[PDB]
Nucleic acid binder design. Structure first.
Lengths: 113, 1386, 59, 61, 56
RNA sequence: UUUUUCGCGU
């Protein structure tokens, strides 16, 4: 049982290694903030990288979407993209109302436009 | 000197920058945008712009504009104004109507001969009553048709006048104010000013803008004409015309609303125009798809269109704010009444579709009906920059999963192909479970494969398995395209005037510091000017990684041509980096791409049948990958490319992109879009970044590494399938991909088969979005959409097994001189015929395609030949001479009848018919001479009252006899017969055939390449004629001549590559001017082309003499005549050869007699329909599609390693094996093959024999697989239609065993089956009823025995060695000893 | 058999570690290593340029 | 106690793994001997590949 | 037994490979603009040593 | 008018 007790800590430490490797995230090697050179591929723990993204250390187009992706959450934009029934913005609502229904506003004049 | 011949079709970019610069310099203010272009044009204008402005009429127009009488406007506004002409006069209207009536009547008269021949064969001024009724129907053309024809003719007259004058004298400007009423044109090569006096409006445009206006007019004319012909045909026979149908009033109104939208939204209206894809697809889904999918797609389409309209309005208001177009914005923009106009457009599109699958599928021509947007290069570059240089965050588990998926795909491919695991370094990294798979060569399936195994597999390193070619491949390197200059010479593209004085001085000082090769801008010039060239230069550069950190690396950018999406930019690189990229793509294609069958770079109908097939739920996800290139970084696109680098044993070859591109400057390299340099800066790396250029790309470039990105996407999709536990049948093809998701499910209570496929679709879409976000892609709902039973790819619609085509879209731009160089006449006729064949092949309308083709052929012959730019009237005089000759030869009483006969004669004998009758029934034929003779006989049956139902006989009217005599007897003056047969196995020779442009341009190309700095090409050209003589002399002593065996010898020998390069060079715009830095065309080229065209026109005179060349007597008797025998004798007499075998084959159309009922003599092909209905067009049957594939030859590939041999070496080995099989019975064979192997490869005959795939087929005249022999014989009808019928061959095999028994036959049965299927399709087209069965009785006299001959002769080894030594620089890589040693290691 | 089974589990987790670390090695080179001339050290030697070194040594 | 010694040395190897990975993370986000060791590795794989190539060459000869 | 000895003889090799990978990551990530020149010099020295060994 | 411009490709 001595060998088993000796390798139990081996298994625990290996599991910790794998868990923290799973939590590990890597960023792209894009240009620096000053745009005077190229930056190395920053790599680190997920929480620190999220902190850097929020503090604008690493510039990105969509910070909130980055947080949602790294935190394993369904963002509102993603839900809208993959919604069961997509909504209609007011312009599309007006276009749908115009299409569905017989002509009422006339204006069948090419010279008007 | 040299002449500048402009093009009659745009085939290019309507650049925003050129129009902006021209307008800015003309009007002394910002014309289209506040870029640097307007400032630089106003400061230092171009010489062409100054010449355009200094015109007397132009100065008056600018003075009038400055005084304020006329209001400046937009090119799109004048596009709309021209399209709604509403200014034609009565005289020109009646003239156009009369011309159109004449064209229609002549086209029907010409098509009457073909229709009569078809009807006579089938047994069912104008002789056919059907076409008599058609002519009676189409007597008065419709007003929209006259309008479009008049507009097109006016624009084409303006263009042809300008082109002719420009050819006559350089630097000509055409000032026109009478061709179009109320319109003023100042058209020029470098500008086009349009002024409307009545409306007091004026713009400046480009020559490309005028070209695309003319193309809009031509396209709308073609749509109206095709729809009118189809409707008129359907009026008297509903199954005679095209499947789709429009009244064309809706179509004209649709065009008016579309270009009204374009005018109202300016150049940004093409954003709205492009989104019509969504509306058409939604209308199709409303019919096919279920309730939930159709509603979701409809809502998404509405959102996309409205978002595009809002973005277009915002961009337009931002752009034209501080310009000269500030007050030109329509009042409808601000108040938002444009929504009513867009709703009217959409409703009218839906009405035109008329809730019909055929109409909605065919409507796709609307995209090309409107013009092309003026692409703003700087704006597109800014968009791609902001999309590219953005930091992306990847979970390390996700990257490991993707790499492991790629590794698993590679391992699966290696196992399935070579039956073994790849040699991998990290044998200890794998656990015991994977070690078992490594020792015993198997792989687990996806069901037992897991995320854990993908993580494990991501840490595998392999040894070299594939070999880089040591010698550069000139066929895949050389091209006629352009390359970007080096980084230090990037200013050489921009004009001097635009560049600052210090930049001009710097570039003048730096030119002499660069070689002549890299100082050029074209691929051909770059490689021809390389004095210090080396075959082992690309390999050395790749091995040494010379492209890394190269100071002379730059990436140009230019807007994509003829693209409705302005955000399409194509990039160029210097010669070395272009070589590296092309090589990486080529090796990925040859070696890695065949591990990923899901990537179709490989018939679209076929591919789509692949997709035509307690509860298994199926789905469909279609994703657009237009922006998928820019989402890749080194951390994503190179973790998988490192696998390819390791497999090839190379470093940084497949990952060159995200190792070199980030360190260089991405610059818009266009003539009229120069960046602002400033002062004391003479290099891109220090030039500041603005809208004109940017640095640190950090992303992919479209096109380059496209195959790598597609295989990475396939690996990602396989991973997605693993993580979602559903099967994926993804079929990615270039820029669009389709996904077939299948997952067995247990149905819940109250849930049907529907609304569960939707749930699977939603779950799979969520998974796809999450995984693409993890890999680094942010695809939105615009690109991707949801479907249940859609098979959509390459703009093709197919569901329920029925394929709905879009033939009008691709036959849309058919005109006088299309797809031609130097306005070639014969090439134009072939292009017209091929484009009009699309209607028959896809829309299933033989007669509509025939009428359209004859309309445009008659237009080209009798309307545009007298207006040829290069030769003013010589072609028309030659045509008149040929027509008079035909009238004298036959008993024709009218020059119109002579023209009809010429239009209906095959172009092989100097005729005018591009599409012979066999093309109407079977696409491919073994030989063309027999088919041409049969076509000529069938056509001559129109004037001579023969009967094709029975056997050919002899009558009093011996015009057919005279023709068949003039083609069988002639003088024999052959030369270079064997090399000519090697080049073209079906060549006739002795001036009995028309001359191809390459045949005359070969001498000029060799003369040019002789005086070239490149030693390789110089020596190849200098030793060309001697090589030709030696090649002719190699195999002149073989008694039985086999043209296909000669072609195999030609392919095996190294002269093939040199002559292929010569032929590719021969297709350039101007030979003898490549090494002169001029884009004009030499007078020698013009004269040579004119002489070729005149000789080609005046060919019927030589082929059909007025004395029959037989002393005006001894006319061949028609009784007991074999067309196959006659054609074979003509070929042998032309080549002065005792016996030519293996090239002639009986014409199936002539041989197969047609009877629709069975009898005691029913010994024919049994073809019958299986669908229980009268009309089977547009319906699917129960049988498998008739691919028409030829019989596979029998081979025994030896067991040896093939990955260590390159593709060129494998091809050479296969060619040598074919040679050994074909010419085994040769007295000189032993040392002939020994010397051939020693020359081509590094091995001897004995060593090479171990790699030869010995052939088990006794006959090589029936099973040989030359590139000059067809590999399949598909029918004219598409794949889906062939599924409605069943075919049999047992009576034919019985009769062919009774006669010519137990021996191979020259006839091909695949062509017979295709002919029968298309025959019954044509029968139902012409009779509105499908026969129950048709029987194809063969005429046994054309049937000939075809057996392997025993060659008697010796191959001239001296001449073979001379050819090998002279063309020693085009040989493939020699199989070295170090490569041969591992050929047999297990 | 328990010792062998848990040794096999440890081996599988070690393979996990090797895979993740190797993909980190590959993704960590980037264009930054190319300009510094250290990507060859990061990814190691390969057959083609080793053969080039061999033929240079013989020559 | 050879198995016990092997397990113990594996334990120090794992502890070194933790320390080295932690210092790598803090260096990337937040020496001569290591470079020498990695160069010696790169050399030993370069020598194994060269051994394979020379075996191929001697089989050729 | 033999199986245990083989398993440990593979495990220690795996640990050595892991240590090598951590070594190369630490070397590449650290030494900003200073260690790169040393790595380049070590690479050219390794190439010279390989050339000398092949010559010998 | 630094060869009018014209990528990779299917």
């Amino acid at each position: 049982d001595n060998i088993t007790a000796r390798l139990d800590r081996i298994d625990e430490k290996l599991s910790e290694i794998l868990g923290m490797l799973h939590t590990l995230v890597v960023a792209s090697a894009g240009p620096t903030s000053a745009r005077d050179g190229i930056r190395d591929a920053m790599v680190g723990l997920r929480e620190e990288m999220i902190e850097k993204i929020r503090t604008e250390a690493l510039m990105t187009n969509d910070r909130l979407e980055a947080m949602a992706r790294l935190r394993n959450e369904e963002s509102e934009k993603m839900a809208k993209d993959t919604s069961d029934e997509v909504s209609l913005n007011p312009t599309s609502e007006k276009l749908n109302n115009l299409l569905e229904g017989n002509d009422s506003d006339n204006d069948l004049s090419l010279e008007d436009f | 000197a040299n002449v500048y011949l402009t093009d009659s079709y745009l085939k290019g970019v309507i650049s925003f920058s050129e129009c902006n610069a021209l307008g800015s310099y003309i009007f002394n203010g910002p014309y289209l945008k506040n870029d640097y272009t307007n400032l630089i044009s106003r400061q230092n204008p171009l010489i062409e712009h100054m010449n355009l402005k200094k015109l007397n009429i132009t100065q008056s127009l600018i003075s009038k504009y400055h005084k304020g009488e006329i209001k400046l406007e937009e090119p799109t506004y004048f596009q709309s104004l021209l399209m709604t002409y509403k200014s034609m006069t009565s005289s020109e209207q009646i003239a156009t109507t009369n011309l159109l009536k004449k064209i229609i009547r002549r086209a029907i008269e010409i098509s009457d001969v073909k229709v009569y021949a078809i009807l006579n064969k089938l047994g069912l001024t104008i002789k056919t009553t059907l076409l008599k009724k058609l002519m009676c129907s189409m007597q008065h053309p419709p007003s929209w048709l006259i309008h479009w024809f008049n507009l097109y003719t006016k624009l084409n007259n303006i263009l042809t006048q300008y082109r002719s004058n420009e050819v006559k004298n350089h630097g000509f400007t055409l000032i026109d104010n009478q061709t179009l009423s109320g319109f003023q044109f100042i058209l020029n090569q470098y500008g086009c000013i349009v002024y409307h006096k009545e409306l007091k409006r004026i713009t400046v445009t480009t020559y490309n803008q005028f070209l695309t206006w003319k193309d809009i007019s031509l396209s709308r004319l073609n749509v109206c004409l095709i729809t009118w012909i189809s409707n008129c045909l359907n009026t008297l026979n509903k199954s005679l015309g095209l499947r789709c149908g429009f009244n064309n009033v809706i179509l004209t109104q649709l065009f008016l609303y579309g270009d009204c939208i374009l005018k109202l939204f300016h150049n940004e209206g093409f954003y709205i125009i492009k989104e019509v894809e969504g509306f058409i697809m939604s209308l199709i889904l409303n019919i096919t798809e279920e309730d939930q999918f159709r509603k979701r797609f409809y809502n998404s389409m509405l959102n996309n269109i409205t978002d595009a309209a809002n973005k277009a309005q915002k961009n337009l208001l931002s752009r034209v704010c501080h310009t000269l177009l500030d007050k030109t914005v329509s009042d409808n923009i601000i108040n938002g009444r444009w929504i009513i106009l867009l709703s009217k457009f959409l409703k009218l599109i839906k009405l035109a579709g008329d809730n019909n699958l055929n109409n909605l599928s065919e409507l796709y021509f609307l995209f090309r009906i409107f013009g092309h947007p003026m692409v703003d290069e700087r704006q597109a570059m800014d968009a791609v920059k902001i999309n590219c240089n953005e930091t992306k965050f990847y979970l390390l588990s996700s990257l490991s999963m993707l790499r492991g998926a790629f590794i698993y795909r590679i391992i699966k491919g290696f196992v399935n192909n070579y039956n073994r695991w790849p040699t991998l370094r990290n044998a200890i990294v794998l656990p015991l479970r994977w070690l078992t798979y490594y020792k015993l060569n198997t792989y687990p399936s996806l069901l037992e494969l897991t995320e854990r195994d993908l993580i494990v597999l991501s840490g595998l390193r392999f040894y070299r398995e594939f070999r880089l070619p040591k010698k550069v491949d000139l066929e895949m390197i050389i091209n006629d395209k352009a390359i970007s200059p080096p980084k230090n010479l990037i200013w050489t593209s921009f004009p001097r005037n635009y560049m600052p004085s210090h930049i001009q001085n710097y570039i003048e000082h730096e030119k002499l510091k660069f070689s002549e090769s890299d100082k050029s801008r074209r691929v051909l010039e770059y490689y021809l000017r390389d004095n210090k060239f080396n075959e082992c230069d690309l390999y050395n550069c790749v091995v040494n990684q010379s492209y890394l950190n190269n100071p002379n690396h730059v990436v140009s950018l230019t807007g994509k041509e003829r693209e409705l999406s302005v955000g399409r930019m194509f990039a160029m690189q210097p010669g070395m980096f272009r070589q590296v990229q092309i090589l990486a793509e080529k090796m990925i294609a040859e070696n890695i791409l065949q591990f990923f069958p899901e990537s179709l770079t490989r018939e679209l109908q076929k591919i789509l049948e692949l997709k035509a097939g307690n509860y298994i739920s199926k789905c469909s996800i279609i994703t657009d990958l237009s922006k998928f290139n820019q989402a890749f970084r080194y951390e994503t696109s190179c973790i998988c490319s490192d696998v390819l680098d390791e497999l090839h044993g190379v470093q940084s070859l497949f990952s060159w992109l995200h190792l070199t591109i980030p360190h260089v400057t991405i610059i818009c390299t266009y003539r009229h879009a120069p960046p602002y340099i400033g002062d004391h800066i003479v290099d891109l790396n220090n030039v500041d970044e603005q809208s004109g250029l940017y640095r640190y790309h950090m992303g992919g470039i479209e096109g380059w590494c496209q195959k790598l990105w597609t295989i990475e996407a396939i690996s990602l999709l396989d991973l997605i399938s693993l993580k979602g536990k559903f099967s994926i049948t993804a079929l990615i093809n270039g820029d669009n991909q389709s996904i077939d998701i299948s997952k067995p499910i247990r149905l819940m209570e109250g849930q049907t088969h529907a609304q569960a496929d939707y749930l699977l679709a939603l779950n799979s879409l969520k998974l796809l979005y999450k995984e693409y976000a993890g890999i680094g892609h942010k695809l939105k709902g615009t690109e991707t959409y949801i479907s249940r039973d859609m098979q959509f790819m390459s703009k093709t619609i197919q569901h329920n097994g029925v394929y709905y085509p879009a033939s009008i879209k691709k036959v849309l731009r058919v005109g006088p001189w299309i797809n031609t160089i130097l306005d070639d006449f014969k090439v134009s006729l072939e292009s017209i015929g091929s484009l009009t064949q699309e209607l028959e092949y896809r829309g299933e309308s033989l007669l509509c395609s025939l009428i359209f083709r004859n309309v445009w052929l008659y237009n080209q012959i009798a309307l545009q030949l007298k207006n040829h730019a290069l030769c003013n009237n010589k072609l028309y005089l030659d045509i008149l001479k040929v027509l008079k000759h035909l009238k004298t030869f036959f008993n024709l009483d009218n020059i119109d009848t002579a023209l009809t006969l010429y239009m209906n004669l095959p172009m092989l004998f100097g005729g005018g018919d591009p599409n012979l009758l066999y093309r109407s029934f079977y696409r491919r034929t073994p030989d063309f001479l027999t088919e041409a003779i049969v076509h000529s006989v069938f056509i001559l049956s129109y004037y001579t009252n023969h009967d094709l139902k029975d056997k050919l006989q002899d009558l009093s009217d011996d015009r057919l006899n005279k023709f068949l005599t003039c083609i069988i007897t002639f003088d024999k003056n052959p030369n270079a017969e064997f090399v000519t047969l090697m080049r073209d196995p079906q060549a006739l020779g002795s001036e009995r055939q028309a001359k191809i442009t390459s045949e005359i341009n070969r001498l000029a190309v060799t003369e040019v390449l002789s005086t070239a700095p490149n030693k390789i090409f110089s020596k190849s050209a200098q030793h060309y004629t001697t090589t030709e003589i030696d090649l002719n002399d190699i195999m002149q002593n073989i008694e039985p001549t086999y043209p296909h065996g000669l072609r195999v010898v030609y392919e095996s020998l190294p002269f093939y590559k040199a002559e292929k390069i010569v032929n590719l060079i021969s297709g350039t715009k101007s030979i003898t001017n490549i090494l002169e830095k001029t884009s004009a065309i030499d007078l020698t080229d013009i004269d040579r082309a004119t002489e070729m065209m005149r000789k080609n026109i005046t060919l019927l005179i030589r082929i059909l003499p007025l004395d029959c060349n037989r002393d005006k007597r001894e006319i061949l008797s028609m009784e007991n005549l074999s067309i196959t025998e006659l054609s074979k004798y003509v070929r042998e007499r032309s080549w002065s050869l005792s016996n030519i075998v293996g090239v002639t084959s009986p014409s199936i159309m002539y041989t197969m007699d047609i009877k629709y009922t069975t009898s005691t003599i029913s010994s024919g092909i049994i073809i019958e329909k299986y669908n229980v209905n009268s009309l089977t067009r547009g319906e699917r049957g129960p049988t498998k599609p008739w691919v028409g594939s030829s019989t596979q030859e029998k081979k025994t590939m030896p067991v040896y390693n093939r990955q260590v041999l390159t593709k060129k070496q494998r091809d050479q080995i296969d060619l040598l094996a074919k040679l050994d099989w074909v010419y085994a019975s040769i007295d000189n064979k032993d040392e002939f093959m020994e010397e051939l192997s020693i020359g081509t490869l590094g091995l001897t005959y004995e060593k090479a024999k171990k790699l030869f795939p010995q052939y088990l087929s006794v006959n090589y005249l029936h099973r040989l697989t030359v590139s000059s022999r067809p590999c399949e014989f598909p029918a004219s009808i598409p794949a889906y239609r062939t599924t409605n019928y069943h075919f049999d061959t047992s009576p034919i095999n019985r009769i062919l065993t009774e006669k010519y028994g137990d021996e191979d036959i020259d006839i091909v049965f695949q062509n017979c089956i295709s002919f029968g299927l298309s025959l019954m399709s044509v029968v139902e087209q012409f009779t509105n009823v499908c026969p129950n069965r048709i029987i194809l009785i063969p005429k046994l006299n054309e049937i000939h025995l075809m057996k392997p001959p025993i060659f008697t002769g010796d191959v001239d080894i001296h001449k073979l060695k001379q050819v090998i030594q002279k063309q020693h620089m085009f040989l493939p890589d020699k199989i070295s000893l170090t490569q041969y040693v591992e050929l047999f290691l297990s | 058999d328990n010792i062998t089974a848990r040794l096999d589990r440890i081996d599988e987790k070690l393979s996990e570690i090797l895979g993740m670390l190797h993909t980190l090695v590959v993704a960590s080179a980037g264009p930054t290593s190319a300009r510094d001339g250290i990507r060859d050290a990061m990814v190691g030697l390969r057959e083609e340029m080793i053969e080039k070194i061999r033929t240079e040594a013989l020559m």
